[PDB]
Amino acid sequence: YKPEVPGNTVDNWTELRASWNKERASSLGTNYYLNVAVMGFAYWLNEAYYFPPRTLYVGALVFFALYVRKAYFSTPYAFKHEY
Amino acid sequence: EAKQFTPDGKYMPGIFSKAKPLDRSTQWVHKNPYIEAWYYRRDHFENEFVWNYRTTIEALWFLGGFTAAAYALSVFAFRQADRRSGYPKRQILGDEPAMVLPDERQFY
Amino acid sequence: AAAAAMIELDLCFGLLLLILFGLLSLRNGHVSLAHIRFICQCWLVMITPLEVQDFALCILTVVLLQSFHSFEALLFLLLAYIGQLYMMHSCNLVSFYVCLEAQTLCVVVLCGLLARGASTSFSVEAALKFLLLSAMVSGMALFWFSAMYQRTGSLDMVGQETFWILLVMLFKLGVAPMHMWSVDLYGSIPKSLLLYLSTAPKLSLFTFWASSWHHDFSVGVFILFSMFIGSIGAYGQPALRSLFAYSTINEIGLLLLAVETAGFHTLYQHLGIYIITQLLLWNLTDKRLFALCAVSLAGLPPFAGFFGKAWIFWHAMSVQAFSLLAAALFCTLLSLVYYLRVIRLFWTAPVHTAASFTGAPNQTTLTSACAVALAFAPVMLVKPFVI
Amino acid sequence: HGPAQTPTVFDKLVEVTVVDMNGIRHRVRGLQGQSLAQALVEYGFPDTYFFPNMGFYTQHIVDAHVFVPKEFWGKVQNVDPESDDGLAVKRMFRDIVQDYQRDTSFFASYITLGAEHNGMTVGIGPIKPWILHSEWAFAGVHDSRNKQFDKPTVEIW
Amino acid sequence: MFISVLLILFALCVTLIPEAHYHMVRVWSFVATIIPMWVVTWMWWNFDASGHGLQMLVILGRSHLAFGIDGVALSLMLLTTVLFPICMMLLRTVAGFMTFILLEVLVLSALCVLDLLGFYILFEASLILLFLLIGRAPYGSLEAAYKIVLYTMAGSLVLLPTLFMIYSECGTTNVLYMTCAYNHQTVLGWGLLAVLAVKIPLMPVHLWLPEAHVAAPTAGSVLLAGVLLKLGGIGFLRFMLPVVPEFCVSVFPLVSTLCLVSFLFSTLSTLRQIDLKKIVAYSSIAHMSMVTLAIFSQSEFSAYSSSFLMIAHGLISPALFLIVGILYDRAHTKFILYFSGLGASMPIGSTLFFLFTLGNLAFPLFPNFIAEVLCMVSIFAVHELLAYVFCVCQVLGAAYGFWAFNRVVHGLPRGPADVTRTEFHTVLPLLIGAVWLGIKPMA
Amino acid sequence: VFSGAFNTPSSTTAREPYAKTKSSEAEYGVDTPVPASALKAADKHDALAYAVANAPLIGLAGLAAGAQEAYMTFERLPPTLSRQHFKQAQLLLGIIGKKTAYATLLGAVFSFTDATVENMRGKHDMTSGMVAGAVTGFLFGMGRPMPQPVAWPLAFAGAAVAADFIGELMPKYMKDYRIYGPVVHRENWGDPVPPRPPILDTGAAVRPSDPGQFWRGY
């Protein structure tokens, strides 16, 4: 016995193709912007190490809850001709 | 009507022989497709869990309910044992500083 | 009197003679240069002082030179070793800057030079990105050194400007979220430079940190970023080069936890075990030993990686760094899954190892078989040894 | 069992017409149960046409970008887009094909040759430059006479 | 110690035998596990029962790894040395022989260690061996292997900083000085509870066992059920109760409710199982819950009764796994719907199945009866209701046991033929041990 | 030591509390001072001032996530959209500002609910953190399908509980922990007394909770 793949093959393969019909950007922009963000604004966290631990833990959970994943990322703005 | 042994012992494999040799797989079961499907489904039944009304209600009243009943019974038994042994109130986890561990040099 | 500086004059004279010998050997059309490599190793031994860390770097670079074959690559590695050695003795930001920049230029040129086949343009691309990202970090170092020099009037490394110099040092170790230059380098550059990049500069920079650095700040958020990003990235990336890049980010997060809680003895023990594992990893031809690297990078108990992780955990628990320790334990639980993926790939598979045809028959079985005996080092690791 | 026909290779033969990227039509013979990427490799196509299947535990499988007509769309095997195999196909579409993608774009290892493929015409699609490691990459230009079939091993490391 | 080095080096010589000599490979690997059984029997001969609690001590300098013998460790070591040659009779490759030889070295050294860091090093060095044993490529299950390895790693990683906390607190991980120093018992108690509540299957960290104990081969199932669960019990008896006793009193309502709900819910789940190996696999959780509550009662002779239940389980449940393994080996299924009338077709196998069914349900003339009576004496002496919960739920164990036996043994005769000489001699030492320990266990 | 009859450490206890152990010849702590912003941020007597002191840090997390999402959206913009600089600026600043405001709102709600339950109950314990987590997570989980309006209060309350246990209760319980010198309540064992606690140059996330644990600095 083997389980059946759910769905239709044409519809599943169109789902697999979606949002990838675009040339991928080079990674130099992401890396340069990350380095600029760290070298310019990471000193804002110097006093944060002394803040109460409930605040630090809730802030860490908030950063995890609002994080957007870089892999498999897509925007509807990539395929529209006006804002 | 196979011959897998010589007259003086000496097992023969019968790889090229016409007659079907009796071996380890001789009594393997003929699989019923629906039985195999049902056992496969029961093997992967965690894909069928859903937070509907009945699941939530039964997980509250039976699982959480009997877990709370067993915790209450355990605390009841602990307190009654400490009272019937001559002890004062004793410190369980989260119960303020009190007596734990009676002294053997003491008469209670 | 210059009589206390004969080792420096010996360094310069040896370079002057080695260039001329390499020129004379190439005028004969010699297609191999093992004599040049032996003279380079002799020069490495002759310029190194009598400290533990200096000789650890020296013996490491002598072993590394057996994977390099051209004259120019050997020259670039020697001039990168000069920066790596003299950074450990740097007591200012002048010498710090020059040693770091010499190392960066040597690495960039070697990444350009040694690529071959269809992967040539990918290696050149990743070298260009690394050079551009390195230039602005070097500018940040110079700018904040100028700020410190104006404020204090001297060359002391004190005050608020040391926070940016610390960020420069964290960039050079590939600490997340400034980690993506190393991730780019791992995907395209050949295995010998990847072996060089994961061992020697980390030793040099951590020895400078142990010897002459104090800051009034913390590195805890970069510990969290490195450990979580490295573990999740290595869990999610199917290419093996990216797996090992992200697992390296996780390991540098553990080394930063050892730095942050003081106690550099656990740092040095874990770094040494990691360097020996790296020497095994990038010189493997039999794929069954890839599983030994997996069980000794997952921290599994009888092998030496367990001991290297476990003194870091012990000293962190000693000074009560509870939250960073809990994050480290969670990421250690995550790391086991992809090291098991490694074991599934290369241990539970049929064995095929191709023979050599043009001589040099399995040329680094000595080093790989010697480094696999990290199952016998744990008897010495349990004692008070590294302190 | 009686006087029925002896099994021949011609009973299991599948013929596919393949148009390469220069427009040259090719006759490709395969066997039932063999994937399409394997038949393309054994025909003698160059190694620049092929790339690793980018899943976990399957990078030793070579794969190619093929254009499949609408009649044979339903004979490509089904992949769940939520599973890990779906994320493998998504990674391949994201990184290898990019803006060469069409509505007929598939991958050749997901086509298992049977009698329903007999007479099907496919075309080889273009791909972007990629790298797996130093010993397996593609610079972007299909200028090489080296066949994929002549490689003794497919190396993940 | 010198003997142990010689036994290890003799065992490791199986790899150097050329594979074309099949008879020699079989005989060498079987003798390599026979010899430690003789040595542990001799250690039982050498033991002075009116002497000190710790005998035959050896300590290896400043490397941790200190060893000693008490009664619980000695009984468990005897059981392991019995169980390993039976595992050798159920394997066919040198890879299997070497995995079980390395497992025997690690189990035997872990059972008698007196150092907490030594216990940590010796026990979970078996993790990768268990992963490869359970997730073997054609007939195993990688999901089960991932589950058992990840649960064990999670518990061990909780323990490791607390181990190092007491080590920095007093200066040693030796249990004789850890029990005599002042330590922060709540933290270390939580770490030790975290490892040993995964090793002993205690709810909620118990889901690895139904997958792993079924996906394993028959030898792996014999080892995992009869031996490796009891390392949690000997962890309780050797390390946690002597070193953190204040915690062990304060956690008693929580450990008590965990044991009660594990017993009841695992017994209720066993009734709906449709796989014979899954039926045998669930039943072990309730027995270990009774073991854990008897250990934690600390009331009359709690170490004695709990060790005796560990031995009775370690004798009876591997035999049930052996009978299920015979059925699977010669019928290629473990499914109840494919088996009926096994009394007419395997009379000897069905008789052995019935006797071990009665033993698993703690009927008299089996060591489980004496074990459960003494465990309930230890539980009763704290309170009568904690004993009543286990007493009134005896119908629920007998329901699944007799339902499984009656479904597979009676009815229309279909299924494989009766046992061979080899299968009978795999079963036979467990039966002799059960008859002795259930009729005249002591003198 | 080990018998089947009983467990002797389960009934061999001290009859009196102990005196404080002398660990070093100098018994004064050395540490760097805390900045005044964090000293003010610890005060809970004014619930509004507590929320005002704590919420900008929790808003920094949303700022970081929003800046990430804004750059990842900017990179995918086609040239016909990217060259319109006012529209591009308002789109990216909208993404960043929405994330920052949502994080600041969740942080202010958590801090105000925490200090309100603190002042209402008259004591400091773990109940205020659990209630504040339940309120904040219910605010996050509103309007979503249904595992989520229960799952998110549980996650935020669990973050509060982990914060209490790891950052507050365990350091308080182990204030008398010593790694050096005499073993605490075992001074008869004879371990020597050093002249001072050990000097460690630790980072700002690892600071001594007691004056006798170690001396921090250089």
Ligand SMILES: CCCCCCCCCCCCCCCCCC(=O)O[C@@H](COC(=O)CCCCCCCCCCCCCCC)COP(=O)(O)OCC[N+](C)(C)C
């Ligand atoms: C915590 C006490 C240990 C008890 C554990 C339970 C043992 C299970 C079986 C009960 C048998 C009782 C045997 C009593 C006499 C034997 C010698 C003896 O005294 O026992 C030893 C230890 O006993 C053993 O090791 C018993 C071995 C039992 C294991 C049997 C199972 C293995 C056999 C498997 C089947 C083999 C069949 C092979 C034939 C084909 C020490 O225990 P204590 O008397 O409590 O020690 C005294 C304490 N102190 C020194 C401090 C004064």
